[PDB]
Every structure is written in C-alpha cells, then in structure tokens.
Symmetry: C2
Subunit: 85 residues, 2 copies
C-alpha cells in the first residue's frame, strides 16, 4: 500500500507509472554481499537466484522511484545488465 512521507520528483527523464522493479543479470558471487547491502540500504529486498554456473541474479520487489533509481544506477555503476520493471 501507500506509506506516504517519501516523495520524489527530480528533474530528468523520470517517467511516471512503472512497476518499480529491477532484475539483474547473472553476476559474480563476490559482488553479491555488496549488492545485498545496497538492497538492504535501499530497503528493497530481492531474491537472489544462484545459477548452476556459479553466478547469481536478483529480482527486486517493487519499491519507490527514489529507491528504484539508486538501485539501477548502482547496477549501472557495475556495468551489469539489468531490467527495469
């Protein structure tokens, strides 16, 4: 539901109405602790599926645009492939 308080409306190409979800591509297990830290810090939480190849990817459950933006921008810092949903 809507928890209020947090409002975000920064100038940029910030499109209205999305799912506010981010899915990543399979990345190396050693980056996992730090990305979990981001999700925890951004209070997003995600399910990290380990693939048999020895890589994992997370799917982050819906949050706000402000938390969303920072999380995807993080994956962008890592140069990882991701999906904004």
């Amino acid at each position: 539901g809507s928890i209020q308080k947090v409002k975000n409306g920064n100038v940029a190409t910030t499109s209205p109405t999305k799912q506010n979800i981010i899915q990543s591509g399979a990345f190396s297990p050693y980056e996992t602790p730090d990305v979990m830290g981001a999700l925890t810090s951004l209070k997003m939480t995600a399910d990290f599926i380990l693939q048999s190849d020895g890589l994992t990817y997370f799917i982050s459950k819906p949050t706000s645009d402000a938390q969303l933006k920072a999380m995807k921008e993080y994956l962008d810092r890592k140069g990882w492939w991701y999906e904004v949903k």
Copy 2:
C-alpha cells in the same frame, strides 16, 4: 541426473523419503559468496532470499546425500541454523 562416471555417494544420515534439500537460516551477507561457491562446487544450487534486515538464507535444490552432508556440516562450521529435508 543420469550423467555416469559419478561414484560419489558415501554414507551419510540416510533418512527414508528424504528430499535431500537443505535450507539455511538467515546468515551474514559477506559469507554469501563463499556459500554460493560451496553450492556450485557441491552441485546443489540454491535460492538466496535476502531479508529486509540485511541477512540472507539459501534453499538448496535436491541433490545426493553425500553432497548435502558436506554442505550441512559446512553450515555447522559456520554455526548457522539449517534444516535437512
């Protein structure tokens, strides 16, 4: 699966109708890279659920008891809680 040349099935806690699954309790994110390696090495593979508190746990996919036995003892080496299915 049926891949042949795999003689690795040393005795373990052989309980009837076991699922051969091990789920852990919420543990620290920095140990996640190591445990993901263990799963990948022990050919188990798992889903790591991150909690909002900043801890994660894995649910491992069914494997042989000889593989999982070492994995559960690994969790014990770490002093983490787990369940053997």
